[PDB]
Ligand binder design. Structure first.
Ligand SMILES: *[C@@H]1O[C@H](CO)[C@@H](O)[C@H](O)[C@H]1NC(C)=O
Ligand SMILES: *[C@@H]1O[C@H](CO)[C@@H](O)[C@H](O)[C@H]1NC(C)=O
Ligand SMILES: *[C@@H]1O[C@H](CO)[C@@H](O)[C@H](O)[C@H]1NC(C)=O
Ligand SMILES: *[C@@H]1O[C@H](CO)[C@@H](O)[C@H](O)[C@H]1NC(C)=O
Length: 302
């Protein structure tokens, strides 16, 4: 009676936006369970005991605390693929979790603790969202993501990181580190991240980055706005979108951006954003000969 189970979508149960204080008893045939936007504090075993076929649980926008999640409640679900726990009051990374897990969303919590080996076995994880938490470098230093060899997307934005996370898996394609306090990137950091397509590092403290740190063969989006960069750098062939707003750039040195034109493979660059730098004039018109696909250069004010 508290939830709605449509007869035409019989494996789905909607318990969302109902001011629920507790998770109701879940029938055994339920595969998609929506409990978001409630006032739930605890996740107890008694609610899930027969619900062995759960593939997706949304518990986002609740008041769940780490200490009120019963041991094993998620881990005993052998087909759980997706777990949403964003917008809760979690202080630590939840464990144990089932190894079937593919997508785990933990954004907007208070995660400041991450137990040694908490990520082990999550070898099927493709998406991990930890944005808006309290992570700091010591939690990540032992290469904790390294065995997640299917991980495609890692969101670590709006945390308390001072360094680039070490030993990220080589599968990774999307890395967000926006709104941390990262100031350098170590020399060969990207050597074992050849699949990186999207790198978001806006709102950090980047300044004296290595020459050709961003010479990345599969990068498509590079977002380094609101940092302290003084110079342009070599644009890699694959890049399409470049976000450089709100840095300390006096001139975009076109020769550094493009030292040679190869007319058999033109660079893919399509979009540059450079507003709120210290540029006196537009970039040299010769940019269009190295980057023939440029459709927009946003200058705003400087
Ligand atoms: C779940 O089913 C078991 C039988 O495997 C039963 O003992 C238990 O009481 C049931 N739980 C419910 C209806 O919540
Ligand atoms: C991971 O995914 C594949 C199917 O894509 C499956 O065969 C394998 O059993 C899964 N591993 C775990 C530990 O759930
Ligand atoms: C940075 O993160 C803090 C919390 O860590 C948040 O309040 C702030 O808005 C964030 N800034 C941006 C630009 O996202
Ligand atoms: C471009 O960069 C090179 C090396 O940093 C330098 O020799 C040259 O003067 C620069 N050209 C400009 C700023 O127009």
């Amino acid at each position: 009676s508290e939830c709605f189970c449509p007869t035409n979508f019989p494996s789905s149960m909607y318990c969302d936006n109902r001011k629920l204080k507790t998770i109701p008893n879940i029938p055994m045939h339920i595969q998609q369970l929506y409990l978001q936007f409630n006032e739930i504090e605890a996740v107890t075993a008694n609610s899930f005991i027969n619900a062995t076929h759960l593939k997706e649980i949304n518990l986002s926008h609740n008041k769940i605390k780490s200490q009120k999640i019963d041991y094993g409640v998620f881990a005993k679900l052998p087909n759980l693929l997706q777990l949403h726990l964003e917008h809760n009051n979690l202080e630590e990374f939840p464990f144990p979790l089932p190894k079937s897990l593919e997508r785990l969303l933990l954004g907007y919590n208070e995660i400041s603790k991450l137990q040694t080996n908490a990520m082990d076995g999550l070898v099927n994880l493709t998406m991990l969202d930890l944005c808006y938490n309290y992570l700091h470098d010591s939690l990540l230093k032992d290469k904790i993501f390294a065995k997640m060899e299917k991980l495609m997307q890692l969101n670590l934005c709006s945390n308390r990181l001072e360094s680039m996370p070490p030993g990220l898996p080589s599968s990774l394609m999307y890395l967000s580190l926006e709104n941390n306090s990262i100031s350098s990137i170590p020399e060969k950091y990207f050597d074992k991240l050849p699949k990186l397509h999207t790198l978001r590092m806006s709102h950090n403290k980047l300044q004296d980055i290595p020459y050709n740190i961003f010479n990345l063969p599969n990068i498509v989006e590079l977002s380094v706005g609101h940092n302290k960069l003084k110079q342009a750098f070599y644009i890699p062939r694959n890049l399409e979108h470049l976000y450089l707003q709100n840095n300390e750039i006096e001139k975009m040195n076109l020769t550094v951006m493009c030292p040679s034109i190869d007319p058999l493979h033109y660079h893919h660059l399509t979009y540059i954003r450079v507003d709120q730098n210290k540029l006196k004039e537009p970039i040299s018109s010769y940019i269009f000969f190295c980057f023939p696909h440029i459709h927009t250069i946003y200058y705003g004010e400087q």
